[PDB]
Design a protein around this ligand. Structure first.
Ligand code: 5BN
Length: 271
């Protein structure tokens, strides 16, 4: 670890941009403080659309995770495109790539659990990668089953989160900017309608389900993410299904007609 030289803090454990004094390579260091080699498997989980975990340095009373370093996260890129708006071809490519990474680790029975713009990294080659996988403060992207107390949720929670992000890239506003758990759950219910046994069997048996939840109708998906086309709205619709079992999987999402004309644009980045 005396092998590394900090360059700057880039994320808040904390994450630093570091320079390996020997290899001379620049990386991202995750400093963790406050017993599972779930991490040891993550180490072998390599894919072009997943930020690579280079090393795990366990010494003293700290745990440092050395990762591949990308220059910009999707959040910063979105604000930089706020007035112009991320072009659809670029949006499509990004969606497509993330779905590739998710399909990959999901087939390995590994979930990210906390997908969000800041956990998505981009480079100048037009690539976007999943970063900072969580292990078993913003609730904006949490799927409803989690919000409802599901202890053993599936890979479908990453799809929900990605769907929210998809919606954000298109509209340039958070789909569900909740500021507390109930508020998050209620902003979700206000948009897609309160879930019931019809559209989500077993929902009322969810640990935090409350028969007293207000009952809202589902608003038209045409009001949710304009001016996205029919294909896009069809895909988002299936990524946002209440029932985790009916929610589309990453793999099947790859075959959605929306990705028929998918290309790989190269973003104009201002590093
Ligand atoms: N999700 C909070 C911050 N986490 C990481 C951020 C970055 C990053 C931000 C701006 C540029 N880069 C990186 C990053 C990483 C590996 C693991 C991480 F958790 C983060 N490699 C990175 O480049």
């Amino acid at each position: 670890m005396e092998n590394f030289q900090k360059v700057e803090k880039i994320g808040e454990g904390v994450v630093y941009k570091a320079r390996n004094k020997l290899t001379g390579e620049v990386v991202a260091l995750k400093k963790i403080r406050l017993a599972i080699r779930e991490i040891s498997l993550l180490k072998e989980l390599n894919h072009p659309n997943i930020v690579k975990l280079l090393d795990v340095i366990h010494t003293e009373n700290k745990l440092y995770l050395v990762f591949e370093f990308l220059h910009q996260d999707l959040k910063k890129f979105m604000d930089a495109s706020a007035l112009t708006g991320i072009p659809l071809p670029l949006i499509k490519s990004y969606l497509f790539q993330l779905l590739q990474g998710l399909a990959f680790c999901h087939s390995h029975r590994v979930l990210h659990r906390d997908l969000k713009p800041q956990n998505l990294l981009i480079n100048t080659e037009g690539a976007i990668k999943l970063a900072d996988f969580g292990l078993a403060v913003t609730l904006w992207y949490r799927a409803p089953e989690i919000l409802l107390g599901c202890k053993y949720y599936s890979t479908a929670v990453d799809i929900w989160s990605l769907g929210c992000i998809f919606a954000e890239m298109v509209t340039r506003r958070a789909l569900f900017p909740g500021d507390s758990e109930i508020d998050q759950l209620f902003r979700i219910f206000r948009t897609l309608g309160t879930p019931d046994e019809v559209v989500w069997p077993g929902v009322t048996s969810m640990p935090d389900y409350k028969p007293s939840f207000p009952k809202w109708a589902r608003q038209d998906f045409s009001k949710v993410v304009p001016p996205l086309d029919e294909d896009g709205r069809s895909l988002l619709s299936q990524m946002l299904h209440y029932d985790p079992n009916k929610r589309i999987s990453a793999k099947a999402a790859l075959a959605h007609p929306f990705f028929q004309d998918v290309t790989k644009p190269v973003p104009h980045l201002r590093l």
